[PDB]
Write a protein that binds this ligand. Structure first.
Ligand SMILES: O=P(O)(O)O[C@@H]1[C@@H](OP(=O)(O)O)[C@H](OP(=O)(O)O)[C@H](O)[C@H](OP(=O)(O)O)[C@H]1OP(=O)(O)O
Length: 122
């Protein structure tokens, strides 16, 4: 309460990938820069979002997080700036890459189960 591990994340404004430790708990995805950090770098509520496999030109074992009900809106999420101050995220989509084909399978299964497990999923 359900899965943890390293994954790569593509930046919002522009590109550049970053390695972050992710924690799937309470239908939310928390991420940190280092496993020893005391406070979250960000929080992404999973409710009302979907996940799809994608083919990135360079990074293998990828998938994306997006909002199927509001094309064009920024995904509601929290993140901390360099100075530590909290602000809203600016992602319309989140692209992620896993460490191995098996782990990608594991993460997509866990995320889908988490989302569908919600009483409001329908
Ligand atoms: O542009 P943003 O939408 O603010 O995304 C930002 C990125 O900004 P850019 O893509 O414009 O370079 C950051 O890149 P950098 O470390 O080079 O500043 C980083 O990639 C950060 O990642 P980090 O918060 O894990 O450090 C993202 O924040 P997110 O958490 O929202 O992805």
């Amino acid at each position: 309460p359900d899965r943890e591990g390293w994954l790569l994340k593509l930046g919002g404004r522009v590109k550049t990938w970053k390695r972050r430790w992710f924690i799937l708990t309470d239908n939310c995805l928390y991420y940190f820069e280092y496993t020893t950090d005391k406070e979250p770098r960000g929080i992404i509520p999973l409710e009302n979002l979907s996940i799809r496999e994608v083919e990135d030109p360079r990074k293998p074992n990828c998938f994306e997080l997006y909002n199927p009900s509001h094309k064009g809106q920024v995904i509601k999420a929290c993140k901390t700036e360099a100075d530590g101050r909290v602000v809203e995220g600016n992602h319309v989509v989140y692209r992620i890459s896993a460490p191995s084909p098996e782990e990608k399978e594991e993460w997509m299964k866990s995320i889908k189960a988490s989302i569908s497990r919600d009483p409001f999923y329908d």
